[PDB]
Ligand binder design. Structure first.
Ligand SMILES: NC(=O)c1ccc[n+]([C@@H]2O[C@H](COP(=O)([O-])OP(=O)(O)OC[C@H]3O[C@@H](n4cnc5c(N)ncnc54)[C@H](OP(=O)(O)O)[C@@H]3O)[C@@H](O)[C@H]2O)c1
Length: 157
């Protein structure tokens, strides 16, 4: 299975200055829950913002840099390499990867951040006439999770 994994705001912002525009612990837990034991594919900029591989899952970074060799990280140099990765593969950003993969994935795990943030990177436009809502679940708000958010699982119609 090939899945997009992303959080975007009401205007599809996903990033600002190579970081998430929001602080939302519960979404990071959501990402951790979904991707643990599986594979995360990320563009080079996204990986460098994280800085180290996320524990307990396969970390795959897409880059043109043939000198890239990071302990705990598997490198790939083309989109086509993604299709060789066994198991459940999550496309985990950034903008370039989402743009390259949105027409190819089976489904998408999208956290809609119900706010308007300043962004410099965006998730590409999509329509629900192409995607069925398999589930839609409101995130719980608390002390440390203060922005309304909704967990969507969308499956290509
Ligand atoms: N909101 C979310 O759920 C979420 C999740 C992850 C990331 N993000 C955000 O996304 C933003 C980064 O997005 P971005 O588009 O600027 O960068 P990116 O997608 O993370 O990285 C772009 C780089 O990926 C490599 N790449 C992409 N496609 C390639 C291809 N077909 N062949 C070879 N290399 C390829 C290239 O690396 P080289 O230049 O080294 O060749 C390219 O410069 C950050 O702000 C981050 O916070 C948001």
């Amino acid at each position: 299975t090939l899945s997009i994994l992303v959080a975007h705001d009401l205007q599809r912002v996903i990033g600002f200055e190579n970081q998430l525009p929001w602080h939302l612990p519960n979404d990071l837990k959501h990402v951790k829950k979904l991707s643990t034991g599986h594979t995360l594919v990320m563009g080079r900029k996204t990986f460098e913002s994280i800085g180290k591989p996320l524990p307990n899952r396969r970390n795959v970074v897409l880059t043109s840099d043939t000198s890239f060799n990071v302990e705990g990280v598997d490198v790939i140099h083309s989109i086509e390499d993604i299709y060789q990765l066994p198991g459940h593969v999550f496309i985990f950003g950034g903008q370039t990867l989402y743009e390259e993969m949105i027409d190819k994935v089976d489904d998408m795990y999208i956290t809609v951040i119900e706010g308007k943030f300043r962004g410099d990177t965006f998730f590409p436009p999509y329509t629900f006439e192409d995607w069925e809502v398999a589930s839609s679940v409101e995130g719980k708000l608390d002390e440390k999770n203060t922005i309304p958010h909704t967990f969507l699982h969308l499956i290509r119609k």
